[PDB]
Design a protein around this ligand. Sequence first.
Ligand code: FE
Ligand code: FE
Ligand code: MO
Ligand code: MO
Ligand code: MO
Ligand code: MO
Ligand code: MO
Ligand code: MO
Ligand code: MO
Ligand code: MO
Ligand code: H2S
Ligand code: H2S
Ligand code: H2S
Ligand code: H2S
Ligand code: H2S
Ligand code: H2S
Lengths: 476, 476, 522, 522
Amino acid sequence: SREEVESLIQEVLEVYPEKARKDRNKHLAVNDPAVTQSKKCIISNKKSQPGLMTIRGCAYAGSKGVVWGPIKDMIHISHGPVGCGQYSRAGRRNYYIGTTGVNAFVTMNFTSDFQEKDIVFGGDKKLAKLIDEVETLFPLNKGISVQSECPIGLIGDDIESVSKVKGAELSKTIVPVRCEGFRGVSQSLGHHIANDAVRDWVLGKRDEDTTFASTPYDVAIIGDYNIGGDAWSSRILLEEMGLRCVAQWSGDGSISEIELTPKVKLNLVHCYRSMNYISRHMEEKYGIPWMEYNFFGPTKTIESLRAIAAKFDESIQKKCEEVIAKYKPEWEAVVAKYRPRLEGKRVMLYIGGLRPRHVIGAYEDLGMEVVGTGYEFAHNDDYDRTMKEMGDSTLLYDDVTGYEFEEFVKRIKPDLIGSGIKEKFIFQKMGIPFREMHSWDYSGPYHGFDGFAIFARDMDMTLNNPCWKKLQAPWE
Amino acid sequence: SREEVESLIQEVLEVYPEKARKDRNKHLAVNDPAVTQSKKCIISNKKSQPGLMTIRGCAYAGSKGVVWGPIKDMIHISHGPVGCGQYSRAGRRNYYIGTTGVNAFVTMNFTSDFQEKDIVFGGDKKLAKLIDEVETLFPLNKGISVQSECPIGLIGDDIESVSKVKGAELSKTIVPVRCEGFRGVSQSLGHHIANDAVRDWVLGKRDEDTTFASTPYDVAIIGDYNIGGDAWSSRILLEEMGLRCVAQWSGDGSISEIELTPKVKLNLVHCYRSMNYISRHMEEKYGIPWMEYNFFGPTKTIESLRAIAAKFDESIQKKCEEVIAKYKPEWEAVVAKYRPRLEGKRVMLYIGGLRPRHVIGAYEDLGMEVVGTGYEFAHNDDYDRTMKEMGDSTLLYDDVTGYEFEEFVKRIKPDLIGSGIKEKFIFQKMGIPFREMHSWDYSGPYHGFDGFAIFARDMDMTLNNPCWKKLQAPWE
Amino acid sequence: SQQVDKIKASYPLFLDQDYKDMLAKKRDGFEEKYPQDKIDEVFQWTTTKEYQELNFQREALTVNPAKACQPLGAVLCALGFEKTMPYVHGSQGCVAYFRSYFNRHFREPVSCVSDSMTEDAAVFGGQQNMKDGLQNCKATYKPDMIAVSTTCMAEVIGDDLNAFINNSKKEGFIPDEFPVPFAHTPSFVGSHVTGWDNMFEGIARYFTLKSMDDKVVGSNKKINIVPGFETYLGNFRVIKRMLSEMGVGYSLLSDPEEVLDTPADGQFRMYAGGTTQEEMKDAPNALNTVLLQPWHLEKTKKFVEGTWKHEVPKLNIPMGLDWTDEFLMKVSEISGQPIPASLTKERGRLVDMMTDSHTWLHGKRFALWGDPDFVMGLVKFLLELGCEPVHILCHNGNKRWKKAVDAILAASPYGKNATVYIGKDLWHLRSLVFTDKPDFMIGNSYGKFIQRDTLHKGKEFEVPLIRIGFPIFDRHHLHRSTTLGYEGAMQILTTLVNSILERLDEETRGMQATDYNHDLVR
Amino acid sequence: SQQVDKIKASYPLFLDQDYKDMLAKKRDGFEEKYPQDKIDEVFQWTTTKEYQELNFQREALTVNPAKACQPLGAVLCALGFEKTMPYVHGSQGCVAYFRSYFNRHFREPVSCVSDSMTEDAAVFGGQQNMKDGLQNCKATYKPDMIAVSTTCMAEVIGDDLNAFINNSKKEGFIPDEFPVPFAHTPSFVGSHVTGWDNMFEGIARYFTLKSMDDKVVGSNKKINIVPGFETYLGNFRVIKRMLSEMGVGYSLLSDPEEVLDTPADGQFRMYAGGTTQEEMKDAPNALNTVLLQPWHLEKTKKFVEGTWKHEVPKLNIPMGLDWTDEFLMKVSEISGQPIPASLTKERGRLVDMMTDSHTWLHGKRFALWGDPDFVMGLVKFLLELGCEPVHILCHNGNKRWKKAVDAILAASPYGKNATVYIGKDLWHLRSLVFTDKPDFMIGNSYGKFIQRDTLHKGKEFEVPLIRIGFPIFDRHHLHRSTTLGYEGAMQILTTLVNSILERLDEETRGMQATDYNHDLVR
Ligand SMILES: [Fe+3]
Ligand SMILES: [Fe+3]
Ligand SMILES: [Mo]
Ligand SMILES: [Mo]
Ligand SMILES: [Mo]
Ligand SMILES: [Mo]
Ligand SMILES: [Mo]
Ligand SMILES: [Mo]
Ligand SMILES: [Mo]
Ligand SMILES: [Mo]
Ligand SMILES: [S]
Ligand SMILES: [S]
Ligand SMILES: [S]
Ligand SMILES: [S]
Ligand SMILES: [S]
Ligand SMILES: [S]
């Protein structure tokens, strides 16, 4: 009821002082899918209002936690005091194959553990010596990045001179990343900062190298961080269709992969938010075209598989249909098992910058409707894409506060909530089934045909779990 | 002092009714090593007084639990109701090498699980069917024994006829054993009944098979049930000395090596109580001499090797001095570490039919003193050997009652008690270190040179454990 | 040899090469052992369904039972009474076994006597043993009460218990006033649970049968609680706590909690706490009687309904969420006490943990065994957790019980793959875990050998044991745990999800092989 | 591919052949990976003593720290006060991490706000953030109090918190009387436990520093208890249980046990329980104040002594038998209450458990890490059990603390092989368990990656982890358990001995190889 949603938004807003009330109305909207530009109904990518318990992270999360950290054969230095690196050690399931501590380092926390002497006197000498110790104790690393924490740029250390000086000295790729948390307003700027850091320090390292054997079917998966194996559940289908995935950015990614990406003929972009910057750059510097796709659920996977096949020739279009034919019984049996258990059930979402629109189709493939969705840090070009994908008169919330989300859920009463760790235990208290839609609740993958079976399994396991019937005592 | 111990006996005896007091006085005594026949000081191997909490078990424990049960490639049926086979399942650590449930069966519980209808009508038919089922589901078993529990001889069953008929119909060794727990007064008659069953149904099978060739150095270890590996750390010394150990009776024991035992040159008897019967029989039937030995501690183990080796030629005696020389620095290193920590401590022992005297030399090798010892079911010839081993004016108790042993301990205040699982938790609560001297408290081996190191480490870790300083709360 | 500063016990001492060499020489020289190819072929055979079919065709052989004999249970029941000595009329080998069996589970002293009936009593009966036995025991161990049960020798030979005890008093072996309740406990009938029921009903009769004339139901405003055969200290303690938390007056009849848990402060206490004699005398005056484990308390039930005129409510064992709820509501119905805020919050905390752990528990398949009330409680709780109770085995179960567990199964979608087996043993269960492999066993220490068997077929076939039940011998102090009520439910839940998570860590510990799923956070 | 009936998550799905082949072609196609032979060679080297010496020569690089940063502690401290909103003046990224860190350990909601200082506040200071944040927070989430901490950005640019808060009251963003205690909590000083101390000292000052005139020591008959940084619910509970059992009047200053364990009953409670402001305002009237964890309550101590003039007892953390003893005796001395028989019995059941289990614990060798008071109490109890704590790591430990633990170790022969490390991290520790292998690790979930590393050298080199400490992320509900008091000692004892026995079973499960020692009874 569009009139009832508008009333819900106004009611919830009455708690705020006038200043926050005015700002937050701009970040809330009843969806209208015919509108051509989302900025006319909801604003995004703004500062969070102080004290309202935003769910957002910082630019260091967006750059170290999200983009740089998954690269497996580099070592990433959380540069600054000991917190950022510890809370973000092995919290994100960006999966990989390697010998951790030996040739891979992803789930390890390397840090400069700033003490007051480093804040008072500068960190650049310490950073210098730290790189020597890294090279001494971890000789198989293939590059070092420097993930700046808040104090770095505040004391004005010079991590570029060190990255230039020590880089020439030891003949290794050493990447200064100015992702200090005070920059920007969310993880989003971290994305952009890290993309530029790749561009400025790594991506052009083979610009004068014609020795790679390029085929007509070379692609790169851009913006899939392989959560629980998501990128592998996608890579198998691309290669079974007859393409060769030279690179994965950045889940299970290797630095050589990144350096070989400018040799690719087509950039397949899953996460538009975090890596559309480098996609546009590669189209500019190297002329590599790029397209967005979606491997959530069979409806979207089939659409993308054929959209991607269309950019190549008939031999790729033919293996494409042989892949869609290969998997049809597999996903049709998942639908048959689990759509009867889920049809008509209502779900509300809140995630970061892609999944709050990209999973809609997978839910519709099981007969559920998303009646509420929202992002921590999306931009207007994300909401452009969202409004088309959500039903009319559904609720959109940008940088939702804890208070609003609890109030929306209380009035809307969804059957399932898909959000993050900081939300999970709140709504279970209320007796609302909850699935983590960042960590997949330690399950997955959810990408592709194999991921859909696991997703359907996971929504049903929790929505229909017997625990949710026993919240009220039989005696009040 | 002597008269001090005599008054302790009489004050303990004051609690009893007349009949019990007059009987228990025959079973208590102050040692006197000069007495030539122990029956003049202490009476033994009589019925237990009712209601006094004897620690003894029964004839089935002596036969199934002790003698037959360890034979690894036979299947032993506990015949009667379900209790006896379940309580004695894997309670005794008679170690063996085998694939359990396939070619070895020691830790399994096979039972005929007598129900009322089997008591009323008899279980011979059930036993014959049970035998067929055994042959079907365990085809690699090399023979079966039938261990009679209390009801079998009371209800008039004829397991002997069943075994002969089934054994001839199946061309199998099936041994009927009348070790019902109402026979005898203790474990001891089960030993005898068990030896007679070996004698009558197994031992003569190869009396005319000349296919095995004996050597002048062939021996059998008689009466070592391989607790914690005891018989293995025994065998190793014998074969280092140049002998060939044809058989182990019955720890890690096969039926073939039992059948091969009439071929040996000398029977070496560790446990005299449980195996002197069959050792005497092989001397009269086969001419095979037998001799007692002791493998607890360096002093006894060295004595034993020398007295054994003197039964063979100069080449075995030479090897014995070589074995003694090899292990001399090892047990000296053990004595050097542990004797200082144990020097002067007083032990009280209460065990079965052998170790109450047999481990005394081991304690004395650590400077320890055995101030009292006793036996559940020993005979006069055991106490004859015990009075020479125990010091003068020490305390001796036969089939001690629960009350007697607690009162003796309260007055003697020993530094350590070595007894059974039913004794352990009483004396720990009194703050007196306790070591199981049946199960070795899940440690061992204790026999031999390698077993001495473990025995010393174990007496130290328990007698000197920090926990014994802690039982008094500091506020009293 | 030994290195004195790093002494080896049997494991790993006997892996040394000289011991290895000696043991191969013993085998080849004298054991006449089957070839290792044959042993392997037969072991494989014992994992097949062809083998399983033969296995379930047994009528006469039992292999690795999951029950013990009646007198074991009567001893445990007897120990729950104040200054009471368990006294088993019959052969003494039984009592050595009962004591050591309980010793090893509780790691406590277990006090019990026999009267040492030998072949002379087989011939002439055991009345002399009873007369002297009663007098010796009373005088030597000063019990206030001697609670007599029987071994199978004394049952087969027909010893008239009641006459022997009467003659003991008439001829002055013990005082006429001295309490000597008795029960026949034939070990060839039922199992250890039956003996507990028989013992308890014998004690209840001794103190209430000939004095019902002055009894008024509800006069003392309490509820009697009979726990049945119970080897978890936390279960005696949770029931008492929850009743005290409600302000409910109660009498716990058979309460060995103190005597199975004495402190080591320097003195051995042969007796401690326990139900008082005056509590049994006054028990008919209670409002009602709650039977915590009714599937082995049927003889006791018939007597309390028949003679005390109590309307024993039909409650299942208070295990898991639904049945703990029903227990407190019936207790509130009987007592009039409301369910206090503390217990409703504890309940919500259990539900909170269920929501927390449901994703790891869902669809996990289990084989389990035990006594009937415990087994059905466990099945009921696994269903509430969304797990699948695939192989449900109760060796000492009966068809009436099986009917009840099957309908519990039929009420939940998580019981579609479940089968109840009664009268089957752990060698039966072994075949089932090979042919229809579950994720885990929940069971007692004898389960360890089934686990060992399944690993031998291969790591991918191994069924890990989760130890809950009786007896537990190979782990320390698990008898202090709780299985009843929300507290027990939370302990069971925690053990189950953490067993699942420990196993997954083990399966994903392999570097560059499986450790991609070796997540820090689960 | 998937089979609908048996869906495989990431493990073991990616072990399918077609995924395995695809991953091989990615490595060889584009990953330019070092040869497996070189990977193995480098791994073996990282396990050597030569690597260890290089590794212990780091002066700049920290790897796998065993500490966190100050405002994590401040947030935990603040959560223990009734209706209190933790509030971290600074950048939002931090609070997201604080909340999720605690979410994964407790499996509970963790409420905490930021005032979201951005580049704009980095240039001109966060004054407007504090004014609008405090007003927004109070209006939206309605706390009775807002406890303020800082992130490293706020410290570096040097916001005056007192001036920002006082101005917020002056210019009307929040009422004058509304309580806004604060503390500076720089992450580059100390660790998370230092933020707890600074936060508690700040809240203590807010309610007492200017009100001391009317207070005198001992007027309320209570004993103040300060728990410090505590992440086991059972530790708040066992302290409150023992004191109530003693009849001691107490006040637990910072008590988050309620808000960290709310029930799942259909209602989300942002706030529950907690120390009240009245309890803090009245705290100086107590007889005295005991600090359960004095090695990270130094600042709190100076203020409680300097201002309340309480003669803070010299007490170690109450872990193990000796230090729970001393805790109870001093509490009894200060309060005049005797230690009741129920606590004396509980102590004796712990010693009984030590006697039952000492032969399996004797001589076992442990590596361990955590916070300084936790670690010192683990060391003491391990020595009381006759265990050898050889590698003792406390990343955030000071030289005075190291010396004191050294003193304890020199007091027992079981400490003869122990060494205390401060400022060392889990990569340091990883080398120690390779070059001087213990039997087990006792530590938080980051130790699972050391176990994974030790196993990669071989099963013979594996060092299993026993999870005690914080955070524990890969098991469920261990945060409900207890480490303090006799109850915490019984739990640590049972876990340690059963870890030894679980591993011994694993080592002896191989049929005909090592299962001669696969005992049923231990
Ligand atoms: Fe104990
Ligand atoms: Fe929870
Ligand atoms: Mo809006
Ligand atoms: Mo649109
Ligand atoms: Mo594009
Ligand atoms: Mo005597
Ligand atoms: Mo003698
Ligand atoms: Mo002899
Ligand atoms: Mo008790
Ligand atoms: Mo609480
Ligand atoms: S790691
Ligand atoms: S650059
Ligand atoms: S077994
Ligand atoms: S025979
Ligand atoms: S009671
Ligand atoms: S309190």
